[PDB]
């Protein structure tokens, strides 16, 4: 017999809205494990590091080098 | 001493077809130039056997010129180990790095009957001007006894130029 | 030694500010003088400046400071500006910086 045999549930992680999608206040934007997308303008980040639109708007991505990747919501939806 | 081959020009004409044609694709470049060239394969082999990035190939090619090219890469395709592309580096006078063969001249030179010859490098990398190009390098070193290791400045350093360093290294020793 | 306590604590106190997204009232106190800008980030642009250098005053820098404080309100409040966030940068909020701050009232408020 085998002492192996487990695995855990898929956590269905990753990005839930991409650039230039129209979001709404509260929409969550990224589901993620560490801080690998840091919150930008109008983007909150919850205790599971999870990012959500603060305002209705549209989503843009920004790659700031050693500063990291950033998700902003650009208002006036 | 002087290696002339040939060359030609190309723009379109898939290298698959050329290669199928007996002609070895390649490129021609230096600081001032980049150009697509091909050569005959059989022609190139006979020269490159000899030349081998140690010596200057003067090309030629149509609109006949003579370009002081060093060959700086050969890409062989691994399956058949036959060269599938060459790129020729054209000289003009600025100090430039390259590989100069070594000549070990002498007897075992110390601890004879018997030592260990033990050549570490068959070549060396040296920053050298196009004008004076040292086609080989004399290594005598009467000893070379047990426990001695030749580094860099213990080498001839032909009147042309200096090294590509680092001066601390090993070339021959006897253990 | 990479990236000193100075420049950490500096970032640490700055980054928090730049989050709330107000106008930033930045404060540079030197050994002689004390200067203050009011900056709009995302336009990357200074709006209203004040200093002991440009107002050519001296006499006891904590008192000088409060003066470049009242000086900044004045100039700034004039453009519509109210509600900023007080930088304080590397400085403990104390002394000369506390004073430019607590003289930066009558406009540019909540500190």
């Amino acid at each position: 017999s085998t002492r192996n045999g487990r695995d855990s549930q898929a956590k269905r992680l990753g990005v839930k809205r991409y650039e230039g999608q129209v979001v709404r206040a509260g929409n969550i934007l990224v589901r993620q494990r560490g801080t690998r997308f840091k919150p930008g303008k109008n983007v909150g980040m919850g205790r599971d590091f999870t990012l959500f639109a603060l305002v209705d708007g549209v989503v843009e991505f920004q790659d700031r080098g050693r500063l990291g990747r950033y998700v902003h919501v650009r208002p006036l939806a | 001493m002087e290696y002339r081959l040939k060359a030609y020009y190309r723009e379109g004409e898939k290298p698959s077809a050329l290669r199928r044609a007996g002609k070895l694709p390649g490129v021609m470049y230096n600081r001032h130039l980049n150009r697509k060239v091909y050569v005959d394969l059989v022609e190139f082999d006979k020269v490159f056997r000899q030349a081998s990035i140690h010596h200057v190939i003067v090309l030629e090619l149509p609109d006949g010129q003579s370009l002081p090219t060093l060959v700086r890469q050969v890409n062989l395709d691994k399956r058949r180990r036959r060269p599938e592309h060459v790129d020729f580096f054209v000289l003009s006078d600025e100090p430039v790095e390259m590989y100069v063969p070594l000549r070990f001249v002498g007897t075992p030179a110390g601890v004879r009957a018997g030592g260990v010859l033990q050549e570490i490098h068959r070549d060396i990398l040296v920053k050298v001007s196009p004008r004076n190009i040292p086609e080989f390098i004399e290594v005598d070193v009467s000893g070379l006894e047990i426990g001695d290791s030749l580094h860099a400045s213990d080498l001839k350093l032909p009147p042309g130029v200096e090294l590509a360093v680092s001066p601390e290294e090993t070339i021959a020793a006897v253990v | 030694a990479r990236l000193t306590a100075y420049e950490r604590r500096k970032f640490r106190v700055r980054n928090r500010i730049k989050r709330t997204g107000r106008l930033r009232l930045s404060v540079f106190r030197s050994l002689k003088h004390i200067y203050a800008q009011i900056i709009d980030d995302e336009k990357g642009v200074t709006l209203v400046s004040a200093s002991s250098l440009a107002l050519k005053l001296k006499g006891n820098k904590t008192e000088v400071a409060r003066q470049v404080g009242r000086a900044l309100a004045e100039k700034a409040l004039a453009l519509g500006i109210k509600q900023v966030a007080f930088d304080r940068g590397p400085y403990k909020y104390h002394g000369r910086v506390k004073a430019l701050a607590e003289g930066a009232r009558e406009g540019g408020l909540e500190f």
Partner: protein, 141 residues
């Protein structure tokens, strides 16, 4: 018998034999070499059957370089087969060898002497080979 000391995982997946490639391939250490014509898992007990064929031909003389190494664990099910329960039971190790790679590669021996040794050495191998010499094409580096 070659075999890694201190493995990180015993038992790794089989994976494919595709794409003759990836280094080795140019004869860096010696005067002559054995190059792989076809892909194979080549077994530690195969490599040493080649090594010894050659040292025997040099009468303990010469220099021999090997240059493939069996780091891939080979499992087997005891006899007693039945599919399941687990995976089980590493026998040997193999090195994966795709075409154009140099294994072995002698030096410090007369040409016809080494060429006879490499030919022997080759018969101990499951795939086809090619004997090679060394070249301008094997560059400098």
């Amino acid at each position: 018998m070659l075999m890694p000391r201190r493995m990180k995982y015993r038992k790794q997946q089989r994976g494919r034999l595709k794409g003759a490639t990836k280094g080795g391939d140019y004869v860096a250490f010696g005067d002559y070499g054995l190059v792989a014509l076809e892909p194979a898992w080549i077994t530690a007990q195969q490599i040493e059957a080649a090594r010894v064929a050659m040292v025997r031909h040099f009468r303990r003389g010469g220099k021999i370089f090997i240059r493939i190494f069996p780091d891939k664990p080979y499992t087997k099910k005891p006899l007693e087969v039945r599919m399941g329960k687990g995976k089980g039971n590493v026998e040997g190790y193999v090195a994966v060898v795709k075409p154009g790679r140099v294994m072995f590669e002698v030096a410090g021996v007369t040409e016809e002497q080494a060429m006879e040794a490499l030919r022997i050495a080759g018969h101990k191998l499951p795939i086809k080979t090619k004997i090679v010499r060394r070249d301008a094409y094997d560059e400098a580096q």
